[PDB]
Amino acid sequence: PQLHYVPYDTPVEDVMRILKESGTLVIRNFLDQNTVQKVQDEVDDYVRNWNPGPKYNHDIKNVGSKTKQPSNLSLMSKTYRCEVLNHPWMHAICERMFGPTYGDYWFNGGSILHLEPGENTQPIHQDHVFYQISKWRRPTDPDLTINFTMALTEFTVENGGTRVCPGSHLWENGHASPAEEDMVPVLMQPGDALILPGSMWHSAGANRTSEYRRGFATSFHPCHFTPIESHHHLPREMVEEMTPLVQKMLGFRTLNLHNNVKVWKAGEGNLEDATGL
Amino acid sequence: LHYVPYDTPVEDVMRILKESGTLVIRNFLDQNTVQKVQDEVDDYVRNWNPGPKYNKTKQPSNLSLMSKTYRCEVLNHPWMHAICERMFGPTYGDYWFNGGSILHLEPGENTQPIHQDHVFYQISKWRRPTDPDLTINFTMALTEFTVENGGTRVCPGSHLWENGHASPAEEDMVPVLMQPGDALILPGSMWHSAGANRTSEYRRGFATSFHPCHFTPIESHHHLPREMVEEMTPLVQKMLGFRTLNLHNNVKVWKAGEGNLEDATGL
């Protein structure tokens, strides 16, 4: 297994092969320069006023003192919720990853990944560690989550670009963390995206440049799992402008399981019916 | 199958749950409370009842939306929270409401298939019988539960069976005989089934169910009016999905960005 840089027009069966083989890859030109600049324009004041460091106390202390990870992106970015969440590559991969086992999937969470100059290396980790059921899951099973880390600024070795350990997703539970010397930094242009299944060991690097390294992420997981981020605080007019696909992603529609059982229902009917969506 | 009084110590009930997989708590509710839920539900659906001579109806929604007693009193029942705290707490942290249904077997209904309640969790095929349950059901009886009217039957000890084990034989199913107000405790791994109602009258009752906070509930209560959410207790607000949940590792799920959902919605 190795790091792979594939173009946008890669066949889907080739991408899922690399995900099955190496557990990660980079899709170049995942977004265009227009979407990158629009996302930066919408979250500029948000991230600037956000305070560096975690917001609350939890066990996985992987938020550095010089790191900003604001979420709430569907609420603070129109391009995020109207276009980014409808990205065909995300839904093409998510359908083949969760479909045959869980049925529907929806949005788990998504945050800005902002590395201030001088930030040290993030601890190497798997994204699904905050799932208690990850101890039950064998590495042959489908992943509990998948992440889409999109570069807004450049991602270099020196400015703290994300590093992955290809092949570490196939390790059995309890396997020790990969050594730092085994981490492989990811080189990305603005708009490129690194695909991170919940089982791939990875971490942010140290930002040893004079300029911040900023990315932003989306993540999806099976519909039977509670998302880290709710969206019932969003204004009603926002939901009605969302596509039906994004409405389901953000928790406003009933979800169907793989055997046609429904969860997230309003009584016995659909949640969208009782709300008038 | 154990029948225990209401004042049974919590440690005793959890011990019988671990060993037998089910039991009944007699007088779980007073007969008044169970009756009020039905009356409030009937007053909600407002089905047309024809009189003896000639001379605005809603479909059934969530039980917490239909019945004020259900969402304000039944969902705050200390016995359910005492059991859910000890079954989900150490492993999962928070728990919340999974789903609730009105259980009415009309006269003539055949025997329901024997099943486990956690069969619709795909992750049930990774769980070991000694692991904590994925969900727990509390079935409260409004009418009497008898053999003839199709009262629920259980197979004690079948919760320890390996995954893939065959369903228990019908000859080895134990009928649960409950008076109005009692409640049958059904963890997700207990093999059970409703019986055949061979009497002339309905078998009435309802159920609540809870599961770990990291699992998506069967029912969403997002359509509930804001006035109803505000009058709920903070415990019930979290139960019905209006509050941020805390995992065992103190990582929060169901947040509003990085903060709490109840703070963003002004609860």
Ligand SMILES: CC1(C)OC(=O)C=C[C@@]2(C)[C@H]1CC[C@@]13C[C@@]4(C)C[C@@H]5C(=O)OC[C@]51[C@@](C)(C[C@@H]23)C4=O
């Ligand atoms: C910083 C920390 C503690 O670091 C960790 O080591 C491990 C896991 C989490 C709890 C992150 C913080 C929030 C999460 C949640 C989310 C669904 C969406 C967030 C995101 O977009 O990037 C971080 C994401 C993550 C990709 C990883 C996961 C993900 O699954």
Ligand SMILES: O=C(O)CNC(=O)C(=O)O
């Ligand atoms: O910021 C990055 O490059 C990578 N961040 C993470 O993996 C995280 O925050 O979980």
Ligand SMILES: [Fe+2]
């Ligand atoms: Fe991560």
Ligand SMILES: [Fe+2]
């Ligand atoms: Fe059942």
